Amino acid sequence: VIVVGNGVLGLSVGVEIARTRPDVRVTLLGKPARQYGATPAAGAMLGAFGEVTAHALASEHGRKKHALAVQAQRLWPEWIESLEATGTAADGRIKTADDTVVLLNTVGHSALDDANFAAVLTALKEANAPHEEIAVESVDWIDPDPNSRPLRALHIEGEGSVDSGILLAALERSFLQAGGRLHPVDATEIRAVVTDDGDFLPAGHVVVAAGARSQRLVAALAHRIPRIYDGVGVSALVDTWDGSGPATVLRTSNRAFACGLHLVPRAGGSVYIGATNAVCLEPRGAASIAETVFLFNCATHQLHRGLNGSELRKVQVGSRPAPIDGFPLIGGTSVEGLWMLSGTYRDGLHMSPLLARHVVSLMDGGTGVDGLREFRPERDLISAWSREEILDDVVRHTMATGYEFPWRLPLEWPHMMETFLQGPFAELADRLSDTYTPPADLMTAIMFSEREQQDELIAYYADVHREWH
Amino acid sequence: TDVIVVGNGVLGLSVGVEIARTRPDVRVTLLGKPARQYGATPAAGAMLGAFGEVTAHALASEHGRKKHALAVQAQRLWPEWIESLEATGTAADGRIKTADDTVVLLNTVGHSALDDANFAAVLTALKEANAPHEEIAVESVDWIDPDPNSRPLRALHIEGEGSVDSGILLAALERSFLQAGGRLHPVDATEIRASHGRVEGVVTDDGDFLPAGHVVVAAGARSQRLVAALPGLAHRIPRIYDGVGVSALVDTWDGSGPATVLRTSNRAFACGLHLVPRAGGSVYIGATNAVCLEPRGAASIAETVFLFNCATHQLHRGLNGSELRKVQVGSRPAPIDGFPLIGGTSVEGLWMLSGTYRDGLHMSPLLARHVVSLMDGGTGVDGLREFRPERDLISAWSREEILDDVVRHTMATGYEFPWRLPLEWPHMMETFLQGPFAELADRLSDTYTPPADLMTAIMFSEREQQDELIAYYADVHREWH
Ligand SMILES: Cc1cc2nc3c(=O)[nH]c(=O)nc-3n(C[C@H](O)[C@H](O)[C@H](O)COP(=O)(O)OP(=O)(O)OC[C@H]3O[C@@H](n4cnc5c(N)ncnc54)[C@H](O)[C@@H]3O)c2cc1C
Ligand SMILES: Cc1cc2nc3c(=O)[nH]c(=O)nc-3n(C[C@H](O)[C@H](O)[C@H](O)COP(=O)(O)OP(=O)(O)OC[C@H]3O[C@@H](n4cnc5c(N)ncnc54)[C@H](O)[C@@H]3O)c2cc1C
Ligand SMILES: NCC(=O)N[C@@H]1[C@H](O)[C@@H](OC(N)=O)[C@@H](CO)O[C@H]1/N=C1\N[C@@H]2[C@H](O)CNC(=O)[C@H]2N1
Ligand SMILES: NCC(=O)N[C@@H]1[C@H](O)[C@@H](OC(N)=O)[C@@H](CO)O[C@H]1/N=C1\N[C@@H]2[C@H](O)CNC(=O)[C@H]2N1
Ligand SMILES: NCC(=O)N[C@@H]1[C@H](O)[C@@H](OC(N)=O)[C@@H](CO)O[C@H]1/N=C1\N[C@@H]2[C@H](O)CNC(=O)[C@H]2N1
């Protein structure tokens, strides 16, 4: 077995294959640099209820994803125990918090933040999950600017965070302990694996978990595996002024174009703050000025003014694998022995133990986890929303980038922008395809891409229609 | 991974048959004894009731118009469902279908405020749906020989609205379940075991433990009491009470029976008169309805006399000298908020199919297909999402609507007897009933109002049972507000 990719997904499936099949040789590819790597840039939140949006829970496909995230949560305590068991005290703790506080402030669009807070509250009630709406004065540690302060707060019990760096170290250690072999090179081509040093590695099973590069690698063998783009994410490590940190995750609901504000606790007087999100049609390995300023401005005003005078340790950049139809690519292929584990966008890390168990069950002739069949990697592009829903959503999210800044402008201007944004986005959607509509996150990226890149997408969408219809 | 269906009524067996047929990979085990204690299904005629079940009150609420629509959808599944159940048997097992058509009769042995309004609502709902029917001369209704003072003056022929022999249906479902690889284990579930928010399986009343990744509760009136023992769920699954129903099998004086179902519209506290044809010189007559806070396995004298008096006067005087074969008693699962409990739970693998009151049997093919679709990652049937088993109590009617309804239905118990009393007395009772029912509704909860059928049961229950309901309603408010 060859696993292509050394993120959380690759290493998680690697650990589970090595542990449950001691007969077979499992080799895992990928370099220590982890170029464009989502996992090392992640806090990371074990996001289930925190990830709930009104928009997600209005589509069948969105309610399934949520259900899987709830299932994944139950696996984490034993998964961590089994990964820490292969190490010692000095390797550090994977878990950094047990609980999450969701904050509602007015530094955003009412159409996102008010709707999403209500949807989180609802989803917690439906699932009988332990939680309570608490007084904002009872949230520990936070010291917001009064004009940016929360007026409502939601304590979610058993929704926590891991140190993504200690998790990766623990996965590598646990992989080696179970007989896995780490070969620090990149796959160049799947033969039905040729590595970038010129060598060839034979195998009867290849699992592609190469993050945002996963589809580009399998497509060479193009219109049957949905494209994966780079959801470029910026986060930061900060040494706090006094070495303190909050006891819980602190977060807002998901915001304009799947951005969001959160602070994940870390050991040793550090905190993680994140995270920006921009779908890019080509990969990008560096934060923009705008991304850095926006992340820092939100954290200092909405969470703790003490972060203003705190020391910047590191600006982190990773690529969320962003699937063109908005849903993951998990499981089997029309090619025997070819598996794919990618397109997890915001929550691959959270779902990793469940997704790893699913793919291993499939590889052993099982059915794995029930709800994951819809997310077969070899599929027609899913249409989880009407064109109408997506056009309302993309205009709302565009307006939200203003309210999240937050801007100050004449009161006539937001009404002007609302009406003048509708036409151009409606025109783009109609021009792109008669059948497929890109989700909002990707549609804004396409709107502000070159004409050549738009035309290439029109060809792609047309070639996919001919293949499947 | 193993499926356990808890309950051997029409709902349990129907979902059992559909799981076994569409998932040949998995082992499906169905629990429940041949005694079918408190069983609604074996006490049912049963009518495939869609238009016959229409009341003015039902078609005035959003929730009521949805239920009606589902009943119309369920009707279309029955011909192929019967074909597929009879296919697993032979000639000598007998026919599931006993009639194709229903005649709705309007007589004056009831309240004008129910029977006149409900006859008009049935006529309207048939017209709206473009359903085949006609208002016919009463002299053209075959077989009936009513007492002239109890006779109908209007009659409504509904085409393709018929009846099944509930006993032959149950035998055919059991046979069809075994044919599709189901296993029947004739014991009762005592306890559902769950840990870390997932079903492990079922402890049975013989002491054994059966493991499963899917448990479907279709235990009729016992369904909520079984799931409520799990953490938090006591105030998250709406209570189901016993709609105790009395019916009878009669061997007719001459071996004859009507070619159609004969029925009135639904009457005081969802209590109705009907005759369902049977093979071999027998007829089914039903059916009484009384919500009881504890289960009851035996007919009262009052229920027996009322059922027999209505049938002999309003349908056929020949039934008076006809032989009583059997008095039947079953519990219609009566949900506290008046709507079914169908679908998924906060516990993974735990499904519920119950609280169907008067029409679970009719809706069984549709409800079975819905739950199987949900179990296979589908969305099932559109309108049934509203009836999720894990919910705040639904408030489908204002307190005002329910207080008018409970007084009207109370008065209807008089006109349906039918009573003979001084003409001042009904006006006195109308005015003196309003205060006590208004007082009870206000005392019970600031937010929830029990539907009329349940409110009258609460009115005439013990003070301890009323206080327990005040606590229940309060605990449900704290859980969901
Ligand atoms: C800013 C940010 C914040 C995040 N926050 C969260 C969070 O709060 N909660 C959460 O659950 N998740 C979070 N995530 C991660 C999210 O869940 C991702 O979906 C997940 O990390 C994807 O993991 P992966 O293994 O698929 O990809 P990656 O983590 O990108 O790993 C793929 C690896 O493959 C390597 N690779 C590329 N090409 C090749 C090749 N040819 N051969 C071999 N290896 C190759 C890459 O270098 C990389 O190391 C965050 C990500 C970002 C960027
Ligand atoms: C008098 C009367 C007339 C009716 N007429 C009609 C009609 O004309 N048309 C119509 O559509 N419907 C009719 N119904 C029935 C109505 O449709 C019901 O809603 C329906 O039968 C309910 O079916 P069920 O399978 O949920 O419950 P039931 O038929 O009550 O079956 C539940 C079964 O589960 C068993 N059980 C209980 N506890 C356990 C346990 N722990 N483990 C295992 N098994 C257990 C019970 O003994 C019972 O056999 C009538 C009912 C009655 C009482
Ligand atoms: N251009 C220099 C300047 O503005 N000096 C400030 C000045 O002395 C007062 O501020 C105003 N506005 O007069 C003062 C009130 O606290 O804070 C100062 N600013 C600081 N001091 C902090 C420490 O060196 C450590 N960490 C930081 O980030 C520094 N920022
Ligand atoms: N949260 C996502 C978001 O705001 N997306 C923007 C969105 O698509 C349009 O702007 C609004 N406000 O709607 C659009 C107009 O050019 O610019 C987007 N922003 C960008 N694109 C840049 C490139 O990826 C590289 N460098 C950056 O710093 C990125 N910033
Ligand atoms: N207590 C004796 C009695 O009253 N006998 C009746 C009596 O001879 C006449 O009626 C009056 N009122 O004199 C007579 C007119 O038909 O009916 C008699 N009753 C009957 N015969 C029926 C058959 O046995 C079958 N099933 C019944 O229900 C029986 N009822």
TrEMBL record, chain B:
The keyword Oxidoreductase applies. Keywords: FAD, Flavoprotein, Nucleotide-binding, Oxidoreductase. It comes from the Bacteria. InterPro entries: FAD-dep_OxRdtase, FAD/NAD-bd_sf. Residues 2-373 form the FAD dependent oxidoreductase domain. The keyword Nucleotide-binding applies. Transmembrane segments: none annotated. This is N-formimidoyl fortimicin A synthase. It comes from Streptomyces luteocolor. The lineage of its organism: Bacteria, Bacillati, Actinomycetota, Actinomycetes, Kitasatosporales.
